Design a protein around this ligand. Structure first.
Ligand SMILES: Nc1ncnc2c1ncn2[C@@H]1O[C@H](COP(=O)(O)OP(=O)(O)OP(=O)(O)O)[C@@H](O)[C@H]1O
Ligand SMILES: [Mg+2]
Lengths: 47, 508, 464, 464, 99, 114, 49, 50
């Protein structure tokens, strides 16, 4: 019974961690796209 | 007052031949002053026999992408305009040949007798001109044909990281058409075009050798644009292949176009656009890269019976990086295409070859692209595989599972082994039907997992040698009849006794 | 007075006009491509004024074969689409040209696709439910009259069947019409939808407007506005409720981004056009209820990288009033319309707008289905017999509740021949109240499949 | 008729010529720097024609000291390097000038470093294995005789050590001609290679070309071509079996990036030049081997930011038959020589070439390693004791296999003290077959670390 | 800014004002659009460096004036629409640092 | 140590060691909690939590928020208290006793309160 | 570069030198600033090529 | 109460003080819950929090 409770808690914690890491990964993906575009358009603006 | 009128008169003044002069030349791009009547994407010719495509048309000059031999272009060279937009020769003479994106043979054999010339930028079949995709295009891969079927007229992306089996899947698809070709029936024959973009020349030669050893080269044309070639050829190659295919498509033939790879198409177009000073977008691509790939892929279709009923099937290949299917080009081509075969290196290393990640892989044409036998046999395959991938966490603790769940796990392992397939060995649709019948109907339950791949291969062979009546029935009727099913079960049980498991157990 | 092409760079074309005749923004200019293989009449949409009487235009058709110095004629009005009952039963492109019957509709009334949304004082001040007659939609995710509904799904979950059902219901229950804005429509899927609607005999009730993928980004951007202009004509002139499909409105955003990149505008956060929110607002705010007549919209939204914080879905979802997610799992169980009761959501499922009884019953149903989905993990591994008596009771009740959310959709009348059922909201509320109270748990599970209400439930129970 | 330096910007120099004497692209021009401390003859390579009789050139030597308006003379031919049997046993720079004996090749046959690749009609795929003696390479990344081989690596993961080892294993007994091209690598490693080859009497069969990283972008671009021209002379004009080592080929593309923006090109993704793929394709396709004429090429490919998704490594991957991928994760675990057994691949690792036994053993090793890699996440938190018995056994076997893939290499002697070792292919297959079936699960894992063979395995097991 | 002006006129007359901004992230997006159309190089999350100023300039004018100036006040309830509870994003952090 | 002394430096570095080890165990604590840790790590995590909470102090500027008056702990008392914490002399007290307390006498008083 | 020149003078006279550069990361930032002020278009991470 | 409820979601049992805290916190949460468009005068809020 204690193992069932502990593993349910562990699954909930791992799901929360997955959601947090997915949010962080999405933020980093968007930041990488923005930074790449900023570098490209900075190179373009300077011609 | 008179200024505007005189200016307009002079502008209007600007049958004599038109010759421009190169003013700039660098990195595969040449700017040509003059040529007031040049048209967008016209084929300019530079003195050393060189060719270029008028791609930017400013008031000052015409920026032309040069199709090879760029270093022979100099400032002040005379440029002549050919009055024809990009066009390529097309005909039955292109079968068995390797051509560059301009239709010039590079295999070293004789010239190609061109039946006609088709412009690279003709309209794709409109909505009114098409017909619902309903004829299968058997790829010979059990995974693709059972899970994500490809119907001729479809656009099935083959997407995945490098060295995952994409080219293997497409070459197996091309090889699987030999049985159809030998029929001599234009309604069954599938002509093939393998477009190579940016692959090293020896890889193209290896693909040609794979097709020749398998005998497919007699109905396949390779539009090779090796990495040695300018970005112009890497950009045009899919369109040359699509035009060669379209000539057959509008003549009632069925075509299978393989792009290997569209990622290098997009890279070449990006290079050309950046060198032409066009504004860049995400990942430095021009705003019309999605338009490039869509214009290419929407030629693939199935023409209405008014237009001969021909079809063209596109199997574009995309090399995702780090399995990021959300990159710009993968996203564009996933949006464009009708289905996706996601090949993953994790599955490839695990021994799931070809590495189609079932579950994420999908075909929007669906069961309409499967013969009825395959449709009924493979209906339970997807649910069983999903249940297995859910239960896989319990493989360690099978003793604590419900008998139904344990049966599901055992069936799923054998189905996964069943979907494995060695390279360059496509299976006719009847063989695939019998194979998947082994698994979905439980005839593999008694066979050890590590022997399933053998039990299939021998059993089919046995049938092919002794009870070809089943294969003939499936092929002719397209459905697995009840008496045929009973005969197949009897053969299965008779073979079970003679099969010796690798572990020494008895399989009955 | 006519212009002259001076710069051609892909879809972008610059046209010089006399000083006194420069066309205004968003005007539609016509140019001629005379090359035999590629002969065409380009329709260019003026995007910018560059000065010196030059105007930068986004070509709505491929510019291949276009020649510098070619005459450009100004129509004097923006891209104008045909409107009226004539547009029903036919398929158009973004520019108003009929595809299934070329030359048709060129004499109808023509409306500019660039129309300001309703004045502030014309908007309705309270959200009103759209009693679509579907049990699941009415109960758990009530749609909004004049609102926008996300439609998640794919192939093999019956999205097209749901679209046919909604077209039928708007045409028959509300006496309205429908417009299908196929933005970024795969030509294969467009043809399939056209033939399916023709066979279902609902094409006469809907106007199709396809902006195909192979067309340049301009038409993919403007096709939504063209379809919405047809919908606006039906709302404001014919006095008909309209249901405007916009599948897929991510492709509208993407086409806008591509056009912005072509025009040289610096990309926003994730590479999207700086005016992303402005464009989405201009599209969506026109989809609203006015003078008692409304345009409802079901908009399939693609969420890139499954990132709901991405600028495209993030902007789209600020306008959407409900969500309907079609699940393969529910479809495999035979439960058409295939709506996922739990993953779907609505912003009207609030006691203030819906009845308090409605909210209570819907929340009870959601709780039961959530509990059942949680127990499904135990059931699929350990077996149904491992559960407790309370768990078994709840599992049976949830099975029956989820199977009762199915309905004999009008879209199925073409196949099975059973007339489609329109279940009133009150009847649905009372039926699901009874189901959650267990008053019908003694019937077989097969009794609840594809039945339109309590009377059909009793009749099917008797038939079993 | 001679030019005139108009504009100087780092390694890029603009030169104006009379209208009738503009040099062709890739021609070599000679300017002169007269300042005493830096006096030299400066070789410029024409890279662009930019109108008004101005050319733009990439300097080979540093431009420090160059003066605007200094006369620039036109050679009339591209940069040329000496070729023949004479260049063997000698060190040259990118320009072809000898380093260890100045004025040596001034009268040899000279070939232009720019030429088109062999015709596609002349290409024949290679399917013959090249036995190295390294366990990991021979088992999972079997090299090809006459094909192209790569050592992909991040920064400081042992690319130079492994390529020097590869020279020690392939070139010592090679009956042909070797050419080593230092393309922007470290000069100390180049000197160590030179002295090592001189000591082993392999220098007389090897011609070295160095473009080390102290040199400006022009030399780092053209040194690869200079060495490849000697390789091509040996391939074509003599029919000798050729070895072509290159370290590091990425410095080629990187060099082009450094001048990419000064040449006026808009930067592509990650700041690379738009012509990345085209330039690298030309250079790489020149390295192929025609039928009956073999160049076994081995290229060290630097992976910037340890990111294998970077455009340069990704574009290079398509040009290679075998790719030994070195990873910092493996190097950090002490497993020298750093090979990731899962990322690395070979086109001859098929049962039809390497044999059924070899293929089965290699693919079982890959299966075990992939399963262990998947399990690492579980083990790091839940602990190994909670894994399945089969999974626990697999983890033990995987640790032993990972440590057995390490080898005490000859070039790494000064990293481990112990001398190098060679494992025959049959012995590697047998040892890894036994490991995969668990015939060594009783030995401690540390017994498999840096041993190279079954006899060494037994000896180290006894020592433990 | 026009809302703050309407409020400030009352504030400096001795009246107490409450200013609601639903929502200042949509002002930031609009200003980003204008800046990018003016070709001002972007910064973090494609925003110009002025974006902080944009909000501070606005929310500093919400103040409790001293009795020297009539004693009026302007209370500000700026509304910020975070994405996935990401209170650490650029604009949320800016406004937290202003408010 | 040449500036702050051997004892202060030693106590500070022991505190940093404990907190860094606690940070290393952070993912395991997040997933499975302290229960799966080894006994040494379990004790270390307990006193790491107590140290981290004892680094909190009732600042005199915070009186405007929580109404609690602010404290001031002389350096010698801080060094002694953290030496005792790192030696486990307080690992029997509840974690709550160390929030915003600021000192050893206040720590004992709040321990009595709880 | 000044440190390298001072060291090289001793290096070429037969003497052994040890050069510490603290930090080369701050040299890269300064070179980035110089290159951007001179208006060289930058590469990745805004650094010069 | 927030962390106490998070802890109680999996703790087998807790002291009577912990249960009292949980009971009070649940009630405070249900009390601060307030319907929309129904602002309470300051004295009514005082009485409610009382
Ligand atoms: N079904 C299969 N079974 C076993 N090996 C396979 C299978 N399919 C492919 N392979 C092997 O996988 C490796 C990669 O195959 P292939 O070259 O077709 O992949 P690819 O992803 O298209 O590669 P690249 O990106 O280099 O073009 C080759 O060794 C091929 O032999
Ligand atoms: Mg391939």
């Amino acid at each position: 019974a204690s193992r069932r409770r502990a593993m349910k808690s562990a699954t909930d914690n791992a799901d929360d961690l997955i959601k947090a890491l997915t949010l962080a990964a999405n933020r980093e993906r968007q930041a990488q796209i923005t930074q790449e575009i900023s570098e490209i358009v900075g190179g373009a603006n300077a011609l | 007052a008179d200024i505007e009128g005189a200016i307009e008169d002079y502008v209007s003044s600007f049958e004599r031949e038109e010759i421009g002069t190169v003013i700039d030349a660098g990195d595969g791009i040449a700017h040509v002053e003059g040529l007031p009547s040049v048209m967008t994407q016209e084929l300019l010719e530079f003195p050393g026999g060189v060719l270029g495509v008028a791609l930017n048309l400013d008031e000052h000059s015409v920026g032309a992408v040069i199709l090879g031999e760029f270093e022979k272009i100099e400032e002040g060279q005379q440029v002549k305009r050919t009055g024809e937009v990009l066009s390529v020769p097309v005909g039955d003479a292109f079968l068995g040949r390797v051509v560059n994106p301009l239709g010039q043979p590079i295999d070293g054999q004789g010239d190609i007798a061109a039946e006609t010339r088709r412009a690279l930028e003709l309209q794709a079949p409109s909505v009114v001109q098409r017909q619902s995709v309903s004829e299968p295009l058997q790829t010979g891969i059990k995974a693709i044909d059972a899970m994500t079927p490809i119907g001729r007229g479809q656009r099935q992306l083959i997407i995945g990281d490098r060295k995952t089996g994409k080219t293997a899947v497409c070459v197996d698809t091309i090889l699987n058409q030999r049985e159809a070709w030998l029929t001599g029936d234009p309604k069954q024959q599938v002509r093939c075009v393998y477009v190579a973009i940016g692959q090293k020349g020896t890889t193209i030669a290896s693909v040609k050798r794979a097709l020749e050893e398998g005998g497919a080269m007699e109905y396949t044309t390779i539009v090779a644009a090796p990495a040695s070639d300018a970005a112009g050829f890497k950009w045009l190659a899919p369109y040359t292949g699509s035009a060669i295919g379209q000539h057959w498509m509008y003549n009632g033939k069925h075509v299978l176009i393989v792009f290997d790879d569209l990622s290098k198409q997009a890279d070449a177009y990006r290079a050309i656009s950046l060198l032409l000073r066009r504004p860049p977008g995400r990942e430095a691509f021009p705003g019309d890269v999605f338009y490039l790939h869509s214009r290419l892929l929407e030629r693939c279709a199935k023409l209405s019976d008014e237009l001969g009923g021909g079809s063209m099937t596109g199997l574009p290949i995309i090399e995702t990086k780090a399995n990021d299917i959300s990159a710009f080009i993968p996203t564009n081509v996933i949006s464009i295409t009708d289905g996706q075969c996601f090949l993953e290196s994790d599955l490839f290393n695990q021994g799931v070859r070809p590495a189609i990640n079932v579950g994420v892989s999908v075909s929007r044409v669906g069961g309409a692209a499967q013969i009825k036998a395959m449709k009924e046999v493979a209906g339970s395959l997807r649910l069983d595989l999903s249940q297995y991938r859910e239960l896989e966490a319990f493989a360690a603790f099978a003793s604590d599972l419900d008998a139904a769940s344990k049966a599901q796990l055992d069936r799923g392992a054998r189905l996964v082994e069943l979907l494995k397939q060695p390279q360059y060995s496509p299976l006719a649709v009847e063989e695939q039907v019998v194979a998947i019948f082994l698994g979905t109907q439980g005839h593999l339950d008694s066979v050890p997992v590590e022997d399933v791949q053998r039990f299939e291969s021998e059993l089919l062979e046995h049938v092919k040698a002794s009870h070809s009546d089943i294969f003939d029935g499936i092929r002719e009727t397209k459905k697995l009849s009840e008496e045929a099913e009973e005969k197949l079960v009897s053969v299965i049980n008779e073979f079970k006794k003679g099969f010796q498991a690798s572990d020494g157990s008895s399989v009955v | 007075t006519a212009g002259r092409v001076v710069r051609i760079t892909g879809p972008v074309v610059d046209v010089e006009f006399p000083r006194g005749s420069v066309p205004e923004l968003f005007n539609a200019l016509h140019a001629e491509i005379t090359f035999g293989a590629l002969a065409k009449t380009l329709t260019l949409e003026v995007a910018q004024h560059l000065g010196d009487s030059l105007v930068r235009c986004i070509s709505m058709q491929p510019t291949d074969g276009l020649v510098r110095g070619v005459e450009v004629t100004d129509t004097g009005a923006s891209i104008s689409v045909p409107v009226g009952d004539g547009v029903k039963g036919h398929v158009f492109n973004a520019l108003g040209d009929c595809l299934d019957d070329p030359g048709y509709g060129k004499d109808f009334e023509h409306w500019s696709i660039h129309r300001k949304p309703p004045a502030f004082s014309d908007l309705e001040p309270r959200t009103e439910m759209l009693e679509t007659g579907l049990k699941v939609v009415d109960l758990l995710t009530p749609y909004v009259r004049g609102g926008k509904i996300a439609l998640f799904g794919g192939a093999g979950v019956g999205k097209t069947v749901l679209i046919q059902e909604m077209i039928n219901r708007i045409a028959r229950n509300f006496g309205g019409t429908s417009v299908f804005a196929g933005v970024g429509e795969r030509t294969r899927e467009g043809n399939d939808l056209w033939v399916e609607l023709a066979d279902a005999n609902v094409l006469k009730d809907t106007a199709l407007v396809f902006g195909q993928m192979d067309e340049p980004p301009g038409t993919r951007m403007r096709v939504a506005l063209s379809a919405l202009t047809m919908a606006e004509f039906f709302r404001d002139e014919q006095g008909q409720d309209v249901l405007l499909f916009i599948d897929n409105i991510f492709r509208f955003t993407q086409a806008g981004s591509e056009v912005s990149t072509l025009l040289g505008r610096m990309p926003s956060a994730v590479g999207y056009q700086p005016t992303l929110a402005d464009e989405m607002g201009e599209l969506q705010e026109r989809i609203t209820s006015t003078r008692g007549r409304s345009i409802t919209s079901m908009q399939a939204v693609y969420v890139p990288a499954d990132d709901y914080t991405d600028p495209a879905p993030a902007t789209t979802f600020a306008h959407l009033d409900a969500t309907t997610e079609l699940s393969r799992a529910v479809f495999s169980k035979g439960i058409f319309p295939a709506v996922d009761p739990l993953a779907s959501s609505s912003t009207i499922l609030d006691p203030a707008i819906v009845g308090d009884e409605h909210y209570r019953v819907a929340q009870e149903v959601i709780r039961i289905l959530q509990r059942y989905k949680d127990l499904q993990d135990i059931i699929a591994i350990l077996g149904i017999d491992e559960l407790s008596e309370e768990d078994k009771q709840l599992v049976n009740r949830a099975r029956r509740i989820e199977r009762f959310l199915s309905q004999n959709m009008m879209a199925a009348e073409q196949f099975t021949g059973q007339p489609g059922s329109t279940v009133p909201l009150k009847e649905t509320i009372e039926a699901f109240d009874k189901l959650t109270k267990g008053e019908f748990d003694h019937l077989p599970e097969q009794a609840f499949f594809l039945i339109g209400g309590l009377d059909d439930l009793a009749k099917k129970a008797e038939s079993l």
